[PDB]
Each structure stands twice: as structure tokens, then as C-alpha cells.
Design a protein around this nucleic acid. Structure first.
Lengths: 33, 162, 205, 76, 129, 215, 83
RNA sequence: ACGAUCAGAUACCGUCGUAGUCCUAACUAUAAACGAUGUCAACCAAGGAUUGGAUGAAACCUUGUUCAGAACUUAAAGAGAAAUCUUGAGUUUAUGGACUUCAGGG
RNA sequence: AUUGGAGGGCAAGUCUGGUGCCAGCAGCCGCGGUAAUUCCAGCUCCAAUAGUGUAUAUUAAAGUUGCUGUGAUUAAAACGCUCGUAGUUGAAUUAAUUACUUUGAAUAAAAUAAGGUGUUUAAAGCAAAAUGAAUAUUCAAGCAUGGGACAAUGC
RNA sequence: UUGAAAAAAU
């Protein structure tokens, strides 16, 4: 965007909203129940 | 090719044939030296550009470059004894800073002017062309003689030239 | 340091700020005003951070005081909304700053031939959405600006933005009253140890 | 984007950060070549070329990888 | 497709600087990209960077400080002889005292100034003003 | 005489001695008499006279448009345009605009620092309309290799060695000088390697002397 | 004799980039130091912002990254928004 | 082919009417076949809304995130000769991501 | 000491006789239908000068042939669209050739750049008052060698 | 309802 934030240390909420492949280190949204 | 003996040109006409700024700037020099035509302006200009090329080409290389030590010094060495460049200036950069008045000032019509024979630079033409002037041991009838540094105290009148 | 503990907002100061619903902003939220917004209201309206509003206001007043304490006239305040004029003129009288009440004549800052040609060194605008012309003039004179910006007003050509409700009637008088008191407070003309003799209702419409 | 259509699908499986056949399925070509009864279905006659172009591209690669014999050739 | 990873990274950095950004992200981290930034770091054109491992040629985060006017990659890397350096400096750089080239040689990814002293040539990788 | 701007009073009262001090802080010169004070004896030249016409119900309203470029050979130059009915007035009207539009002309070296500035510091390009002019530093000997139109402007800016490349409809003289002025105008805006260090801190002339003009 | 650089150009505190001689949108904000009693002092910090940054809605947010870091502000900008 | 209109009307206007307009089989391969904008890839300001899924709240509808598609609005910014373009016609004399086709005054 | 010219390009006449869209000049724009700065001529000066115009052609101008380096919405110019062979281009990663890169070997002269040398200067010549330039090469290939980052060849 | 045309250079 235009308001630059820290790319190296994103907030927990910031990585909880983005696409799974678009996170800093992509992780699956599925678990094993 | 046709002939084994070599030939070369000395003057090139300017690219733009008509400039109002390039006539007064030439008559200010033609009238200062009392020349015959506009060739000597280009002939001196061509000579200056010739030596300016080597210095500009050599300047691009580093100091430790072998050709800079050999060709660069040989360029200053020739430029030194010719009187174009004073002895105290011994850098390749000073060759580019030279102008067209330096080479024009070494002409025999200008050396005899400062020695006290011709009151006017136009009068010196007869003296040089008439063979009244002898440079050391030889008579000279060519006004464009560029003397060397050692011959500067050596120009004097001849002894009753025929 | 640069922000000592003295300038912390007293609970009385916060008490009146919430009274006028200063924190309650417009519905639409600009991208540049996400930081100043703590959360959203029940009907999807921005709720400004009261702490951040005071911190911005004090910094805004600090710059004016540092520049209006030797040349008070060099600060020009313009009022856009038809009702925010009285608070602007009260600001003019109590600090000596030049003020423009009604419509801002275009070219006032640029047309040197004009008789009413002021050359300020700091412009304060009560509403950037209504005072766009005044803000746009700063781009030709190298003059910084301070705005009482809202949750949806575009923050273009503004340098110091104060997140506060600028559409109600009590908040308009309060914030200019708050800014006027702090400007005098920084200058030393009225220390924080006392209470300002003037009242908020004197600045109201 | 896609091999033939201009679609750009990005749905991918996401293997985590911790470590603790297709040629047969593509002969689809048999199922379409349905074309015997519907001769005027020019749409199917186009997608069949696209399917058969894929098969001739995988076979062109499985030969170099020495997975299929060099005498392999797909036909109906 | 992604023909040149270095081309993608350099264009991302130049775009970020013009917009005035403080940091940029480069997705494919290649050894050419990492050692290219070292040449710019040795010249103080960037502050630093951080390689992030994601097991899939992880990302790179670069921190810039208002100095990189322009960095550009070059179409297929031409073989440059030490005598051909002067031709490239007079073309790809603004002045003899400001710019710097990047060449990949057998002695690593060097610049134009340190390859002349090293006395080697190589394929030209790019430049940064 | 009798300035009507804050910066004008400082110049008149002998508070600002150098024009370059004004360029440091981005102060806009609004009175041409300011330049006539700090920069006496500015060289004069008229680039061209161009006549424009407007078709009316009765005829054509011809007007004379004058381009004049002024500046000192020490690194300052300007360019202004004015259209008027009278030939003499058009030059005079452009005289004020040329003074009003002064700009520094950053100069540098090519080979080494052996004395005085002769060429541009780095490559620059003027973003006029279709005409684009590129400035290249040159060695000491080479003069101004340029067309007669921008070379006459480069003389007034003090540049003695330069290489120029041109692209576009250069036969439009108005855009040619505009492109040349534009290329020089951003000479000081390109952050070279020698301008990295911030340097010292200096107060603005209009802030140190603000109190003298408050009364 | 003469000095080769006609003047030393300023530097914008937001982008750390040179300020043009003709950039008429670039401003200069001075914020004064305060004493222990909350009364301003003659000393102040000079802040310059380039004109191009101003016209995007960024000059306000960029200064808060400089105000808070320098100490003139406390909690306007969170941690992850600082660089 | 008639009847008008007209200086004439072999046209526009009105009436009738063969091929054609429809389907099948085989040809034809051209359109202002246009977004007058080649295909693939990277970066890229702000905003409302929409088509189809996924994921939370809310017991087809309102609301948050995200993915793909047709689009729209603002720009003091970038480009351009300008009109205008912005999910490019931007990142280009600070000229080089890959490939193909096409143009050289009328 | 002549040629060309004296409207603009482009330096040079707000001089005088006729002609009256006729003769004519004019490389392009153009000047001439009765008050021609251009025609035919009289006076004067502008450029060059033992040189000076024309006609044709190579080169630069020409970033109007594009590697450096062009243009393709509207000026000329994206195939109606998709598949596709040859060709071109091809993600990260590893602590036997070839290409690339660096040095050499040897390689006709003359010619280019020149090292020196008063053919009196200069073009020249390698001569003179013992020196021959180490003279630098030589595109594209071939041989040897230091290096293996970027590259191709299948294990 | 009908409304066609205006020689060349200045």
C-alpha cells in the first residue's frame, strides 16, 4: 500500500488475514483432527 | 592506391559556412598577426586538435599504463621544446587547456615582432620573405616557421642578403 | 526529554473532550487515519483515540507557540464552515494570530500585487474538506500547514493533523479552545498550575 | 496463466515448513472421441485438439526422461 | 514467464526507491541476487538486507536509504574484455566519478573498479547509479 | 526600488549578499529588481522573435512573442517568455520574466580537479515537449558542441565544455531553449555521490532576519 | 579562490533525498524544545519535507515516524509501523 | 414493376414482388473480424460497487478477510504532440525481462 | 584575380531604368498583372581565393534502417482467433568437453597511430649530425596456460 | 413538402 509497515516482523493479525500463500512463510490453514 | 609517396592535408573548412560570430573572432586574430588568408587559422587549429587528441586519449588510461609513461611524456617533451607549453607545466591535463593563441604566438612573424625589427606585424612579412632574416645559420623565407625554445635567443638579422 | 510528564492530559481535560463527542468521527475512513482510530462504533463510525488526539494537539500547539511568540501575525488561521468562524476569531484575539473568517479569496497568498496579500509562515485550517483552497495555496509558498482533520477528509498538503470531530458544534469550539489555551501555556503567559479565566462557551457559535 | 485458456488460477496446496500416471488420465481423449454421434459439435472437436496437443507434449518429455520407450506413439 | 530473476528484483528496488519506500521485498532469492546486493552494500548504496528461508527459494527483504537513484539489469550478459570496459562506462554510467558496473567473473561477482585492479573480464550483470 | 515582499526588503536593506543563499531555502523571487541588485551587469541576449495570431470575426490579432535568456557566466541563468503588441515591449516584458526565473547551473569536473569548473557534473535531459536535449560532460579542450540555439544559452550559464544530443522537432526554437533550460534546471536535483553528507545546519535568511521586518 | 559547489542543497528528512532549488511545495517545520516547566526554549530541531511527499497524504504520517523516534511524540505510531 | 416528389429522380417516401432471408450436405475465408491497443512475467496511489467460491460473525439477506473475472471513480503523481491512459498507452536519452508479426512522405 | 551571391536557409543594398503573371529568376518557401529588396542591367560589398560553381555518386546529417537505437489506440504500421514444428528464451540449489575470461608463442612489407631526425618551415624522406621506433596490431579461426562465477552438452 | 450551383492568382 502507501503506509509502509515492517515486512520483516508482521503482526499476528496481519498474517492471520492474508492469503496462505502470500504470508511471509506460507503455512496451511488446515489442521489434523 | 596510386603513388608510393605519402601526402596529407593541413586545413579543413568549417562545417557551418556562414557565422557572424566567426568572422570578427577571426579578423581579431587575422588582424593581430597580419596573415594572408583564413587557412592559417585552420592550419593552426588542425595542428592543435592533432596534439589535443593524444592527450585526451592518453588521459583516459591510468598513470601506471605503460603507454602513458612513454607516449604521454614524449608528447609533453615535444610540446616543451616547441615553446607551446612552458616548462613548469608538466601534466597531460595542461595540453587540453592550450588554446590557438599559443601556437600562433610561436610563428616567426611574431618572434621577430618582439625582437625589435618590424614596427608593424604587416611589415615583418617583407623582412621574412625578403630573406633579411636568418635563424642561426640558415636563411628563412617561410613566415610560418615555429621556432624552438633553444632558438628563441637565436633569431637575428642576416648579413646583406642577396 | 522532549515530552515531559507535565503535559499529560488531566482527567478534567478528557472529561470535556468526551462530552462534545470529539472522538466520534465520520462514517467513511481514510487510509491515512487508521492509526488515529481505535475502533468502530455500533453504526460503523470511527472512534478516535483520545490519547492520540491530545498528543497531536500538544505537538501542533508547540509549533505555533514557537513561531508566534516573536511574530504572532505570521500565523494565519482560516475558517471554512459557516459556524466555525467565532472560534477562529476568538483564537485571533487571544493569541494575536491573523485570522480569515469567511470565504478564502484565491490568490491571497500568491498575488503580491493584491492589497490583501498576506505571507504567513504557518496556516491553520479548521476543516481541510472545506478549506481545500487554503491548503492548496501552501504548495506555491513553501508554508507548512496544520489541519483539524476528520476521519474521512483527505490529508493532502497537511503536515500536522489533529484527529477530532470537526462537524458537530460543541467540538468545534472545544478544540480551538484547547489549542488556544495550550499555545498560551507553552509561551508561559498562562501556566498549567491554574485554570484559564475564559470559558469554552465564549468560543462557541 | 493456464496452458491454453487465459485463466489464472492460483489455488495451490501449501506444504508446511517442516519435514516431520497423468498421461493415462489424459486418455479424456477417448471419452470425447462421443464425437461419433455428435458430428456437428465443433466445440468438442476443438477441445479434443487441445487435449491431444497435451498428450503429444507429455510423450515428447517422457521419452527424454527415459520413462517411456522411444517407440511409443499414441493413437485411437 | 520469469525468464530473469535478477531483472525482477532490480526493477522492484528501483520502483520502491522512486516511491520513497523504506524497504522492499524480493521473492526469488538467487546467489546472483544476494551477491549483487553486496556490491551495492560495499558502496553504501543500501543499508543491509535479510534473507528469509521458506524452503522454496525464500524471500529477501532489503532496507534502502535514499541513495540508489537507479539499478538496472542488462539483456543477455555480454562478454566484456578489459579493453571493452571504457565503452561500457561511457554508455551505462552518468559520470566517471559516480556510477559503478557489476560484472560476473571467475573471481566472483565484482564491480568495474575492482575488476580492473584484479585484471579480469567477465559477463556484464548490470549497474546501479 | 521599494520592494513589496518580505524577501525584497532583505535584499534592499543589504541583508542578503548572495543570490545562492536564496536558492538554498527555496525562496521564490517575485520581484525582478531583486536579481538586478545581487547580480549587476547581467549579460543580455534575445533568442528569437515569434509572431502569433488569433483569428477574430474581423481579422487576426497578431502579437509578438519574445524569448530572452539572461544570466551570468558564473553558474546562474534564466529564461522568460512574453507576448505583446509592441516589439520593444515584448523584449522588456521577457526581461522581467528572465530575471524572475533564475536558476543555479551546477558545474563540475570530467578528469580531475586541476582548477575551476568547466562542464556539467553528470548526464541530464530536459523534459520539454517533443524536443529532448541531453547534456554530456566533455574534456577541457572541447567547446560547446551544440546547435546555435542552445549553445547561446549554454554560454550565458558559464558552461564551456559540454556534449549535447538532441531528439524531437528542434526546429521549434521556443521548445529548444525550454528544453535546454529544463535540463540545467535539475542539475542540482540529482543526488550524486559527493552530496550524500548532510553537512552543517544554517538558518534561513527569512528566519534570522524575521524580526527586523516585523516592525 | 572560488568554490566548486554553488551551495550545499538541503536534505528532506522524510525520504533522505535532495531538495530541488525550484521545489516550491517543500516546507520546513521547526518544533521547539521544551523545558521541565513546559515552556518553550529557543533551541529547536529543523525538519524539512520534500514537496512530492506532501502531495500524497504521506508527509503527515512520515513525520510521526520521525516525531516519535526523536522523542517529540509517544504513542501515535505503533511498533510494527516504525522503520 | 407501379404511384408520388422533383428541372430531371433510373433515389430517399408509399404499394407489390423474383433471388435471398430458414434447415440439411459440401464450398467460400473475408468485416470499422475494434479495446483500431500481440502473447507470457515482475513492481505499482486512493475509493465505492459487482459475478462465483472459501473462511468468521450474524437465525435468500447485512458485515470482515481472501482468491479469480467483467468493469467504474479521483490524482497536485508517471507517460504523451495532445486527445487521453493508470488491473497501462507507467516503471524509457537514468534508453537492455522473453518471443513473434508488422511500418518507412503522398 | 576570378567565381557565386546580396528576400529567408546564409554574409551582403528600406539605391535606380524597363518589363507588367509576359519575358524571366528560382536546389526548397517563393519574386513578377504597372511604385519588383529576388527578372534583365548601372553603382556599392559579402564568402572563398589560385582557386571557384554546376551535374552525378559514397559517407555524416539519419535516433528517416534501430546492436548501441526507432515506431505500431488516433499520423504509416498487432496476423480474425487458437493449436504448432524448426528457431530464440528458459525458477531456486551442489563450500569430461565447450564457451567465457587472462597471459603468451608465432604472425610480409607498404598503409593507420606514431619514437627521433630544421627536406630552412610544410607535404614529404629515413636521412645525417651510430639510429630504422619495442614500432601497437591482425577482424574471424588455430596452439598452449592461470580461473570457474555466469552458460550448453548426459551421467 | 421542395432549397441545385458560385471559374484562377492575389
Amino acid at each position: 500500500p502507501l503506509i509502509e509497515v515492517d515486512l520483516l516482523n508482521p503482526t499476528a493479525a496481519s498474517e492471520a488475514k492474508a492469503h496462505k500463500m502470500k504470508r511471509l512463510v506460507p503455512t496451511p490453514n488446515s489442521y489434523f483432527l | 592506391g596510386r603513388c608510393l609517396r605519402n601526402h596529407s592535408i593541413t586545413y579543413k573548412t568549417p562545417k557551418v559556412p556562414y557565422e557572424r560570430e566567426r568572422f570578427d573572432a577571426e579578423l581579431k586574430l587575422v588582424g593581430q598577426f597580419g596573415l594572408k588568408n583564413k587557412k592559417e587559422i585552420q592550419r593552426v587549429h588542425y595542428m592543435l586538435g592533432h596534439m589535443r587528441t593524444i592527450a585526451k586519449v592518453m588521459l583516459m588510461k591510468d598513470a601506471k599504463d605503460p603507454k602513458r609513461l612513454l607516449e604521454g611524456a614524449a608528447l609533453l617533451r615535444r610540446l616543451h621544446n616547441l615553446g607551446i607549453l612552458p616548462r613548469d607545466q608538466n601534466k597531460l591535463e595542461f595540453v587540453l587547456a592550450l588554446k590557438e593563441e599559443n601556437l600562433l604566438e610561436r610563428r616567426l612573424q611574431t618572434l621577430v615582432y618582439r625582437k625589435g625589427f618590424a614596427k608593424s606585424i604587416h611589415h615583418a612579412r617583407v623582412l621574412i620573405r625578403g630573406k633579411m632574416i636568418k635563424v642561426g645559420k640558415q636563411v628563412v623565407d617561410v613566415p610560418s616557421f615555429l621556432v624552438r625554445v633553444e632558438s628563441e635567443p637565436l633569431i637575428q638579422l642576416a648579413d646583406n642578403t642577396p | 526529554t522532549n515530552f515531559p510528564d507535565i503535559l499529560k492530559p488531566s482527567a478534567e481535560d478528557i472529561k470535556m473532550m468526551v462530552a462534545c463527542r470529539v472522538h466520534i468521527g465520520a462514517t467513511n475512513l481514510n487510509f491515512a487515519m487508521e492509526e488515529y482510530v481505535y475502533e468502530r462504533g455500533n453504526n460503523n463510525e470511527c472512534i478516535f483515540n483520545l490519547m492520540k488526539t491530545w498528543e497531536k494537539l500538544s505537538l501542533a500547539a508547540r509549533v505555533i507557540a514557537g513561531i508566534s511568540n516573536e511574530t504572532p501575525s505570521d500565523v494565519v488561521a482560516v475558517a471554512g464552515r459557516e459556524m466555525a468562524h467565532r472560534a477562529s476569531l476568538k483564537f485571533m484575539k487571544y493569541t494575536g494570530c491573523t485570522a480569515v473568517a469567511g470565504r478564502f479569496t484565491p490568490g491571497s497568498f500568491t498575488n503580491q500585487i493584491q492589497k490583501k496579500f498576506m505571507e504567513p509562515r504557518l496556516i491553520i485550517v479548521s476543516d481541510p474538506s472545506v478549506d481545500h483552497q487554503a491548503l492548496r495555496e501552501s504548495g506555491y509558498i513553501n508554508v507548512p500547514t496544520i489541519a483539524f482533520c476528520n476521519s474521512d477528509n483527505s490529508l493532502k498538503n497537511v503536515d500536522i493533523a489533529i484527529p477530532c470531530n470537526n462537524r458537530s458544534r460543541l467540538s468545534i469550539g472545544l478544540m480551538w479552545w484547547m489549542l488556544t489555551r495550550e499555545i498560551l501555556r507553552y509561551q508561559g503567559k498562562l501556566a498549567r498550575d491554574e485554570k484559564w479565566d475564559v470559558m469554552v462557551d465564549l468560543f462557541l457559535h | 496463466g493456464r496452458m491454453y485458456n487465459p485463466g489464472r488460477g492460483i489455488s495451490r496446496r501449501c506444504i508446511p515448513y517442516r519435514r516431520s500416471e497423468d498421461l493415462y488420465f489424459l486418455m479424456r481423449a477417448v471419452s470425447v472421441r462421443h464425437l461419433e454421434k455428435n458430428k456437428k459439435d465443433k466445440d468438442a472437436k476443438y477441445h479434443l485438439i487441445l487435449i491431444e496437443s497435451k498428450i503429444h507434449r507429455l510423450t515428447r518429455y517422457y521419452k527424454s526422461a527415459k520413462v517411456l520407450e522411444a517407440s511409443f506413439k499414441y493413437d485411437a | 514467464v520469469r525468464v530473469n530473476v535478477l531483472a525482477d528484483a532490480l526493477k522492484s528496488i528501483t520502483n520502491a526507491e522512486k516511491q520513497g519506500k523504506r524497504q522492499v521485498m524480493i521473492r526469488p532469492a538467487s546467489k546472483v541476487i544476494c551477491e549483487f546486493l553486496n556490491v551495492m552494500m560495499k558502496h553504501q548504496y543500501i543499508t543491509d538486507y535479510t534473507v528469509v528461508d521458506t524452503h522454496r527459494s525464500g524471500k529477501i527483504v532489503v532496507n534502502l536509504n535514499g541513495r540508489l537513484n537507479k539499478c538496472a539489469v542488462i539483456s543477455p550478459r555480454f562478454n566484456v574484455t578489459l579493453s571493452e570496459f571504457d565503452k561500457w562506462e561511457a554508455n551505462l554510467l552518468p559520470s566517471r566519478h559516480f556510477g559503478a558496473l557489476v560484472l560476473t567473473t571467475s573471481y566472483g561477482i565484482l564491480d568495474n573498479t575492482e575488476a580492473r585492479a584484479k585484471h579480469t573480464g567477465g559477463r556484464i550483470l548490470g549497474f546501479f547509479y | 526600488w521599494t520592494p513589496v515582499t518580505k524577501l525584497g526588503r532583505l535584499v534592499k536593506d543589504g541583508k542578503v549578499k548572495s543570490i545562492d543563499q536564496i536558492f538554498e531555502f527555496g525562496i521564490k523571487i517575485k520581484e525582478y529588481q531583486i536579481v538586478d541588485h545581487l547580480l549587476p551587469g547581467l549579460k543580455e541576449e534575445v533568442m528569437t522573435m515569434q509572431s502569433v495570431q488569433k483569428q477574430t470575426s474581423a481579422g487576426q490579432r497578431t502579437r509578438l512573442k519574445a524569448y530572452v535568456a539572461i544570466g551570468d557566466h558564473n553558474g546562474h541563468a534564466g529564461l522568460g517568455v512574453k507576448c505583446a503588441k509592441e516589439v520593444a515591449e515584448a523584449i522588456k516584458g521577457a526581461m522581467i520574466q528572465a530575471k524572475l526565473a533564475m536558476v543555479p547551473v551546477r558545474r563540475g569536473y570530467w578528469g580531475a580537479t586541476i582548477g575551476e569548473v568547466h562542464t556539467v557534473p553528470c548526464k541530464l535531459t530536459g523534459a520539454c515537449g517533443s524536443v529532448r536535449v541531453r547534456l554530456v560532460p566533455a574534456p577541457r579542450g572541447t567547446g560547446i558542441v551544440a546547435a546555435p540555439t542552445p549553445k547561446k544559452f549554454l554560454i550565458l550559464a558559464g558552461i564551456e565544455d559540454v556534449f549535447t544530443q538532441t531528439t524531437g522537432h528542434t526546429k521549434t526554437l521556443g521548445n529548444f531553449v525550454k528544453a535546454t533550460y529544463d535540463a540545467v534546471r535539475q542539475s542540482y536535483g540529482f543526488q550524486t555521490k559527493d552530496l550524500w553528507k548532510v553537512g552543517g545546519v544554517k538558518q534561513s535568511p527569512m528566519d534570522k532576519y524575521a524580526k527586523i521586518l516585523a516592525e | 579562490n572560488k568554490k566548486i559547489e554553488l551551495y550545499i542543497p538541503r536534505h528532506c528528512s522524510v525520504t533522505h533525498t535532495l531538495i530541488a532549488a525550484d521545489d516550491h511545495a517543500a516546507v520546513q517545520i521547526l518544533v521547539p524544545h521544551v523545558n521541565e516547566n513546559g515552556v518553550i526554549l529557543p533551541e529547536s530541531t529543523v525538519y524539512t519535507v520534500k514537496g512530492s511527499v506532501r502531495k500524497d497524504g504521506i508527509s503527515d504520517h512520515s513525520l510521526n515516524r520521525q516525531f516519535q523516534k526523536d522523542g517529540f511524540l509517544k504513542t501515535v505510531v505503533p511498533k510494527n509501523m516504525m522503520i
